[PDB]
């Protein structure tokens, strides 16, 4: 990781950079998620996993750099949005209602004033459809709409 320092005169210095842990469970895997056997085994609240693909101020890292699949990058981005909205990354910020599994940005959803009839009800989305295929240990599948 290179950082730019000013004094005006400005220069870039490369500092310590973490390395992937030795002995991946699944070497010769497409993305890091596959290499570590996490294809369908992480959720929005797995901050330890998510923060490894996050800029220090909360922004996501580019797919080219991270090496993630297209679908895995999308999943990580959505999970990170949900974690930010749930307040699970208090240190990754640009510079009071508790939530979680919030798909939409809170400021862009209108109230459901007229929920339709029973056969055409307007349901409130929960979680993200990108995580529909996550490992389900429950008898019933995840309900993405409430």
């Amino acid at each position: 990781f290179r950082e730019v320092v000013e004094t005006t005169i400005i220069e870039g210095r490369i500092t310590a950079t973490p390395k992937e842990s030795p002995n991946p469970p699944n070497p010769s895997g497409q993305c890091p998620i596959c290499r570590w056997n996490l294809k369908h085994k992480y959720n929005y609240d797995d901050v330890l996993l998510l923060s490894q693909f996050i800029r220090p101020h909360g922004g996501m890292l580019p797919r080219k750099i991270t090496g993630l699949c297209q679908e895995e990058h999308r999943k990580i981005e959505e999970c990170v949005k949900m974690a930010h909205r749930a307040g699970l990354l208090p240190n990754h910020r640009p510079r009071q209602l508790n939530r979680y599994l919030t798909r939409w940005a809170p400021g862009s959803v209108k109230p459901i004033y007229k929920k339709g009839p029973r056969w055409n009800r307007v349901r409130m989305p929960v979680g993200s459809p990108l995580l529909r295929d996550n490992v389900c240990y429950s008898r019933t599948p995840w309900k993405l709409y409430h």
């Binding site: 290179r2 998620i33 290499r35 901050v47 490894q52 890292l61 599994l101 109230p111 409130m124």
Partner: protein, 177 residues
């Protein structure tokens, strides 16, 4: 066993005081627990006509958490009865106005729709914050487990756990980040 008749009956039909902590808990799950306890459906001696309900004291109701965008999408509708008296207020607005209305309404909706519902609600004690009246605190008997386990934040994760969790990728050294 071996109790006298009146003490035995009193013990069997006594009403217990339970404590729920609403911090970061879904009001729906809180209401399900509270409704079971209020109806007495958690007692094997339960019967609709036995008036076997218990007391439920829910604290930190101001700090409940909705899944999804329910804070903005869920709407509570009421009518004053007068023309033009239809009021539709979002969950966030209702929570700001009354820090107890959301949980109260959830439990009310989950309770059976009969004449015992308001008697049951009389046994429900909702408190926005950690403070509880002293008499209620002395009454408390048991604390029910929180229905939802609150996920930890990075600020809360211990350095040992972070070390235990492997590094997933080799970031290029020459990257601004």
């Amino acid at each position: 066993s071996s109790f006298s008749r009146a003490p035995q009956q009193w013990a069997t039909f006594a009403r217990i005081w339970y404590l729920l902590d609403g911090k970061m808990q879904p009001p729906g799950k809180l209401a399900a627990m509270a409704s079971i306890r209020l109806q007495g459906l958690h007692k094997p001696v339960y019967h609709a006509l036995s008036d076997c309900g218990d007391h439920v004291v829910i604290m930190n109701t101001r700090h409940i958490a909705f899944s999804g965008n329910k804070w903005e999408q869920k709407v509570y509708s009421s009518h004053t009865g007068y023309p033009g008296g239809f009021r539709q207020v979002t969950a966030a607005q209702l929570h700001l106005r009354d820090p107890v209305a959301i949980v109260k309404l959830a439990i009310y909706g989950m309770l059976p729709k009969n004449l015992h519902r308001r008697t049951m609600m009389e046994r429900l004690h909702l408190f926005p914050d950690e403070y509880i009246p002293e008499d209620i605190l002395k009454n408390l008997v048991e604390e029910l487990p929180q229905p939802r386990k609150i996920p930890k934040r990075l600020d809360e994760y211990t350095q040992e756990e972070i070390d235990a969790f492997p590094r997933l990728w080799t970031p290029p050294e020459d990257y601004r980040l």
